[PDB]
Amino acid sequence: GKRQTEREKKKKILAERRKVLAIDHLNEDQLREKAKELWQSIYNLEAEKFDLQEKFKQQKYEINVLRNRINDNQ
Amino acid sequence: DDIYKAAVEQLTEEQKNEFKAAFDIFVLGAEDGCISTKELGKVMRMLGQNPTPEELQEMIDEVDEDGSGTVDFDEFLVMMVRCMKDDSKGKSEEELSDLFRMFDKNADGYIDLDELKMMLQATGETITEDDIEELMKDGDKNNDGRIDYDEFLEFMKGVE
Amino acid sequence: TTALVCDNGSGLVKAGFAGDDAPRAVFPSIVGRPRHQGVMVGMGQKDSYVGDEAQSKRGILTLKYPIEHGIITNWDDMEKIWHHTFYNELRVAPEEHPTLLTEAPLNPKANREKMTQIMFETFNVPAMYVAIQAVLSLYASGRTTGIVLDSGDGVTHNVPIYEGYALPHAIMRLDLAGRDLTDYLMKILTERGYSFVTTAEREIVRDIKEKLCYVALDFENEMATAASSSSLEKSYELPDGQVITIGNERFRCPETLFQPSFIGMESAGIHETTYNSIMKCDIDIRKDLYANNVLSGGTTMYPGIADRMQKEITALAPSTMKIKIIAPPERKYSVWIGGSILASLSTFQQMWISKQEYDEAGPSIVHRKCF
Amino acid sequence: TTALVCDNGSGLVKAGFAGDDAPRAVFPSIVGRPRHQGVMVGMGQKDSYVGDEAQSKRGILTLKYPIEHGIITNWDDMEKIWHHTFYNELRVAPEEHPTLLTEAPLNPKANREKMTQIMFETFNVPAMYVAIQAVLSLYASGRTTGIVLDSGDGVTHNVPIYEGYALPHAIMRLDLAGRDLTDYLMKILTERGYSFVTTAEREIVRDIKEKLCYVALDFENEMATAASSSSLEKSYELPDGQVITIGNERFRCPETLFQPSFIGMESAGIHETTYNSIMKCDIDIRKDLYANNVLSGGTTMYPGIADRMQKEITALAPSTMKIKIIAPPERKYSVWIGGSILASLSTFQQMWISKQEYDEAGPSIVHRKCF
Amino acid sequence: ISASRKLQLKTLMLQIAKQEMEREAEERRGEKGRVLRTRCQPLELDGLGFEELQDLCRQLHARVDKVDEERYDVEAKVTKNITEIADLTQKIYDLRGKFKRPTLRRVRISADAMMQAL
């Protein structure tokens, strides 16, 4: 396996399994609402990405704490 | 200073039962409630409560210093309730770790005396004999030149 | 930023930032799943211990190397090893660091292409470059000519170089290396009564080989001496007591290098494949190659090999040429030191395989101009 | 709700709610029907006195243990014992409490399946789980490795464990235990004139064994000393007077543990089956097992056994390893304390055999994933 | 050394810690809002013709695919990092407090005063 399944999953998520959307094919109010949906989805997901960045920060802090404890104890 | 004393002011009947049992063991009526600290520790260990000799020795070194053996009721009840463990889980471990990483800005895997003392002065509390060097003496068990979150627990565990 | 000089190797993964003297983290490349059942609950038992962690719990694991002979036979395990190396032994995310892997000569293409594809897709490095393991060992010696014999643990290869121009028709790659010596030692120890079978006990036999074995200057005289006196028998304490005494197994294990007929291999020893590699070169650069023979790799650390090899080559070579064998004390990490030097060069800074180039030509970019 | 940590054992049933320090009710597991006729009318004479009640009326009963060697030979009596344990010694209906029985290693399957079928059909518990009696004793010591010798009253078994991974091929179960020592003591007491025959007098001999016997540090020296001086003769008062004097029967009764040839058993003592159990383990975890040898079970409470066993193993083992024998003062209830700890864990809360699972797969569910 | 001020000190520390945590949460929220606004510009919906919305939604969809790739990347990263962090937390626990989980006890309670009732 090595990871070919994992990369296949990655590609499917980024290209296929994403919310693959045909957008510019709708009536004026319909296209407007779909654009609003896309914009809101981007907003919420970007908030989530910031949360992931903050979690990366917390995990880094925990790693530093664990490393200092290990070095002190071993 | 205030917690156990106020609880004495608002005494509950649950602790009141043990208070009266110990008093009748000591005071048979129409007395000043002297209750010598030596006898206080002996009976506290005797009455099936927590047999911790450390609190008894602290009280003996602390009370009956007048040479009379009499113990004021306020301090008697305070030491009775404090021999029993009065704490609510010492908050949450992960919560306290987050509190301390907010406190600890260096983030070198530990925290030094400087951040701890800055937070201490941010708390806004008076300074007494157990300040200044009691924290240094207590936290420096292996004397690593720092007081980490684990060392901060080692100093004053069960923070409420 | 700084470059990551990783060096997969086969037996010890050596890594570290470019521009230092020694690799930052050196640890065996083994991934061992537990094999027993496990009854304690909540002990926090993982499903695979990699690196140096599995050399401490090896009593209940089944260690298996992911690299057999230079080539990589188990890609998932190799990916796990790389992930461990990046995240736990160096603690630097690969998204912000170029990498410089190393590869043995004459290896299958698919191995190299898969390596670059992994590095670009999974770890998502900015740029990676693959270099032949012998040119680096020549860098570390500070030379620019010479024929380098890099007897690793997986495969022994012998790349001659002159004035910076490698001679591709004179590379002699032989698959006898440290692992086969470990297996042969484990096989001849049975002649005294000590039986090592488990894949965990192969590590114990490897430790015996490292600490006790040495290369004899003259084989027959040593065989005669060890059969009469007892001045050679050195004892060694197993991980549980019951000391063992190694007799003439001491210099018979590494003698396989100069007589590969011991383990049934047909080819000639490392003393004669170097001379053959020289004789394939042109007639005018043979003196320089004779004078600048370089040793590298772990397995060339046996006490007394730099004299046996010189004696053998002097026997083979013409009497007029001077035979000199360069054996630096930092032999084991010679390849990695050379890798650090190469990655620290300014002239080399534009040879990396940039990610946009890979996106345009696919993994087959490595065989192209960016070698 | 809280879990019921029952522990059937063989000789003493120990039970109590999970999360405490000591079992709530400990009482012998004997069921004795009356044997004489009975002339008083209306005395309220029952047909079977179980538990600690039959240790007070034992003068007119015929006590018979329902568990011979770990296995259960008389299911009706065992059901009666369980019913008594639940309703009268704990006074908690089983309809509202999970149960955690314990079972010796290498026991017949049918015993375990019948046990779970009874617990689910008759008492109708919400969920029950069966655990090996040695892993719990390892829990109680707060370790995670070590080889535990759990010499109960029915059967002595020796389960080695490393890093939480039990080694199923190294379990050495031996059927010599406290009951055979009681019978042998009752058999050697006849050499002075005291004859105990009735099944009620076996209890008196058991009391003699508990209060007087001790394990000799060196057997031959003690045999020589007791045959010359009289400093060992300790006296004991029977339940009716007529004191008796035990001479060298004191250390000859528990010596059977280290020389099972006394009662005609072929196998080697508990001092050598531990070493054999260690030697079956892998070569890299033998040091840890040597250093963390754990004792448990009732029969390991003889005064002076933790020194005799250490001396014997040090004689057998290689001279370099350190031999340490963990003998906590709370040896008798070690298995139950470990059971309480295991039942109190959050990670373990989803391993119970839920009743709906039993309804779908029958009693053979116990051998399945829910072990 | 007085046992008097332990309660006041710990309560004051708790108050300071809660204030710091809520302040950090609020500033994180403000930073996240600013970063979102500078990463995803607010939608413009004033007097746009049909083609204006067509083009804007096309640009938004291209950005949607781009950010979907970015966030699936950071999501896989956070999944791997969280898994590894939990594993190392468990490793540190079994390294240090594994000898203490058995010590988690509520003992010496009922049997202390249940002796002479027999």
Ligand SMILES: Nc1ncnc2c1ncn2[C@@H]1O[C@H](COP(=O)(O)OP(=O)(O)O)[C@@H](O)[C@H]1O
């Ligand atoms: N001091 C030593 N003496 C003898 N043999 C050694 C010594 N150190 C390492 N080796 C052998 O060399 C091997 C390590 O070789 P190494 O250079 O790490 O291989 P690679 O080229 O894959 O990095 C080990 O397997 C061991 O058998």
Ligand SMILES: Nc1ncnc2c1ncn2[C@@H]1O[C@H](COP(=O)(O)OP(=O)(O)O)[C@@H](O)[C@H]1O
């Ligand atoms: N203090 C003691 N000294 C010597 N032997 C004892 C002592 N206490 C119990 N025993 C022996 O151990 C047996 C009880 O063992 P126990 O651990 O209760 O078995 P189980 O594993 O079935 O619970 C008794 O039959 C008795 O022979």
Ligand SMILES: [Mg+2]
């Ligand atoms: Mg190499």
Ligand SMILES: [Mg+2]
């Ligand atoms: Mg038992």
